[PDB]
Every structure is written in C-alpha cells, then in structure tokens.
Swiss-Prot record:
Function: Receptor tyrosine kinase which binds promiscuously membrane-bound ephrin-A family ligands residing on adjacent cells, leading to contact-dependent bidirectional signaling into neighboring cells. The signaling pathway downstream of the receptor is referred to as forward signaling while the signaling pathway downstream of the ephrin ligand is referred to as reverse signaling. Activated by the ligand ephrin-A1/EFNA1 regulates migration, integrin-mediated adhesion, proliferation and differentiation of cells. (Microbial infection) Acts as a receptor for hepatitis C virus (HCV) in hepatocytes and facilitates its cell entry. Mediates HCV entry by promoting the formation of the CD81-CLDN1 receptor complexes that are essential for HCV entry and by enhancing membrane fusion of cells expressing HCV envelope glycoproteins.
Cell compartments where the protein resides: Cell membrane; Cell projection, Ruffle membrane; Cell projection, Lamellipodium membrane; Cell junction, Focal adhesion
Parent-protein residues present: 600 to 896 of 976
Native source species: Homo sapiens (Human)
Quaternary organization: Homodimer. Interacts with SLA. Interacts (phosphorylated form) with VAV2, VAV3 and PI3-kinase p85 subunit (PIK3R1, PIK3R2 or PIK3R3); critical for the EFNA1-induced activation of RAC1 which stimulates cell migration. Interacts with INPPL1; regulates activated EPHA2 endocytosis and degradation. Interacts (inactivated form) with PTK2/FAK1 and interacts (EFNA1 ligand-activated form) with PTPN11; regulates integrin-mediated adhesion. Interacts with ARHGEF16, DOCK4 and ELMO2; mediates ligand-independent activation of RAC1 which stimulates cell migration.
Stated name of the protein: Ephrin type-A receptor 2
Tissue: Expressed in brain and glioma tissue and glioma cell lines (at protein level). Expressed most highly in tissues that contain a high proportion of epithelial cells, e.g. skin, intestine, lung, and ovary.
Domain Protein kinase, residue spans: 14-256
Induction pattern: Up-regulated by UV irradiation via a TP53-independent, MAPK-dependent mechanism.
Length: 277
C-alpha cells in the first residue's frame, strides 16, 4: 500500500550513466529513462540494505508519488520488484538553486527572483497542507528548471543545517510547518543575495547565540522593502507569530501582480565606507 501513487518502472527502461551524489545506502546517478529518452536522477538501494533502510526508501517513494504540484520535484517512478531498488525523478540541467545563483550572480531581475520565491512558497504551502514537514528546506534542496521554475526536493543532509533551522527545532526537536517557515525566510535571503552564506563566517554556536540575543540577518543589497519585511516576520522567535505558508504565498502573489510594490528598496547597511570628491 506504500506505492499507491507511483508507477513501477521496468529496469530495461533505465540507464545509469554517471554518479552525481551519495544516497543513504546506494549511489545517486544521472541517467536516461525510456517510456512513452528523458534525463533522470536515480537513487538506488544496494545489496545489504537493512529492513529500516528498505522501509524508509519505499516510504520516501510512496510519499513522493503522493505529491503532484508545479513546485515539487516529480517522481517518474520506482523500481521495487527488482534489485537494486530505485527512485527515479526528473532531472534539471540548471541543477540546485544555491549553486545556480552563485554562478549567475546579478543576472536576474528583482521580479524574476521574487517569482522564484513565490514558487518555492507555493510548493511549501502544498507540503504543509499535505501534513508533510520538510525539516531541511534550503536552496541546496531546490532544483531550477529551464523555465526558472523552482522545485522543492530533499537530497538528504549535505551536516546539520543549524543556520536554516528554527530555534525550537534546534532546542527541543520541534519540527513543524512553522519551523519550515523560518527556513523559508533563510531561503528568501539566499535568493536575494544570489546564494550568500547565511551569517557569513559565524560558527554554528555564534549563530544560535546571535538569534537568541535578538539579532537577525541584515537586508540584502537591492532588496525590496516588502521582501525584507516578509523574511523578518518568518524569523519571529515565537512560533505562533510567524506567517503560515498561505499568508506567504498570498503576499508574494500580490507583490508580483502589482510590481511597482517591489520598487521601494530597504536601506542597505554599508560595511565599508569609500570617501570620494
Ligand atoms: C533521485 C531522487 C530521489 C529523491 C528525491 C527527493 O527529492 N526526495 C524527497 C523526499 C522527501 C520529500 C521531498 C519533497 F518533495 F521535497 F517533499 C522529496 C530527489 C531525487 N532526485 C535527485 N535529483 C538530483 C538532481 C541533481 C542535478 C540535477 N537534477 C536533479 N540530485 C539528487 C541527489 C543529489 C545528491 C544526493 N542525493 C540526491 N536527487
């Protein structure tokens, strides 16, 4: 009953080409899939996996089959009847959003950046409504297609993402859609800075200390006032005071549909001073 919304793929339809990462008990590959070839990513469960690993692997496939949304990575199908077992998803030539933005610094309009955030928020609203808590929302877990559409994914830990994680999730392991909202605020900051490292060189302990003392990330350069205000509200210490994803999607949609609203920029706090006549 775990694989209700998933298609079973026969192994003869799949060609693993090059290793692109590490799974939990198997490699992740780039490959080709032939139905109706399309490029795919392929996570495998290799010989020797434990019962817990099998349960988690097939459960992941099952949950992924349930999702059908423009801003969630699409499951092509699963190989469960043969070994090794596989989870097969679409593949994005542009890759993960964090590396993408870092390699394309300054190349997009404010409206393009905000549109990426609206899509991420819409995907997160869907997950939260489906009662799925992501727990690792970060630009590193978002794929970008050739139309600039962002697809929320989960590639596993890179490393504990302290600086993306809400205080209550760090302090007492309370992961909810409201802690995902905190993470989404960090993702907003990553996007508007073209992939800067949150909190720069602060250590994990220094970040938590700063947050507990009330400090928050400063505005990115060239950032719409409305966008900075929204990310700041995602970082409220009190979980219940944060916007829900429905609120975030609504605001971002309204800002995009009235784009003059994005012309008012938050003041950027200069780190250096250059004196010239
Ligand atoms: C194969 C696979 C299996 C599962 C997932 C995945 O996102 N699972 C997942 C689990 C829980 C929740 C969600 C959710 F959708 F976010 F909600 C997704 C994604 C993929 N696809 C994938 N695409 C890609 C990829 C890379 C470059 C371009 N296009 C796709 N990479 C990787 C990858 C890289 C490094 C380590 N582990 C997995 N994975």
């Amino acid at each position: 009953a775990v694989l209700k919304f998933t298609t079973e793929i026969h192994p003869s339809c799949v060609t693993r080409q090059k290793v692109i990462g590490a799974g939990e008990f198997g490699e992740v590959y780039k490959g080709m899939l032939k139905t109706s070839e399309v490029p795919v990513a392929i996570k495998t469960l290799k010989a020797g996996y434990t019962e817990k690993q099998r349960v988690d692997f097939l459960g992941e496939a099952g949950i992924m089959g349930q999702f059908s949304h423009h801003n969630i990575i699409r499951l092509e199908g699963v190989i469960s009847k043969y070994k090794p077992m596989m989870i097969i998803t679409e593949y994005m030539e542009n890759g993960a959003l964090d590396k993408f933005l870092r390699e394309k610094d300054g190349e997009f309009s404010v409206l393009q950046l905000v549109g990426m955030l609206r899509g991420i928020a819409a995907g997160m609203k869907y997950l939260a409504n489906m009662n799925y808590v992501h727990r690792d929302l970060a630009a590193r877990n978002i794929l970008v297609n050739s139309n600039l559409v962002c697809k929320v994914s989960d590639f596993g830990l890179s490393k504990i993402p302290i600086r993306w994680t809400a205080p209550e999730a760090i302090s007492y392991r309370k992961f909810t859609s409201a802690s995902d909202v905190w993470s989404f605020g960090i993702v907003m900051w990553e996007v508007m800075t073209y992939g800067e490292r949150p909190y720069w060189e602060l250590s994990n302990h220094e970040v938590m200390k700063a947050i507990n003392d009330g400090f928050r990330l400063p505005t990115p350069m060239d950032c719409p006032s409305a966008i900075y205000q929204l990310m700041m509200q995602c970082w409220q210490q009190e979980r219940a005071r944060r916007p829900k994803f429905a609120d975030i999607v609504s605001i971002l949609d309204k800002l995009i549909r009235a784009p003059d609203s994005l012309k008012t920029l938050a003041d950027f706090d200069p780190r250096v001073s250059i004196r010239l006549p």
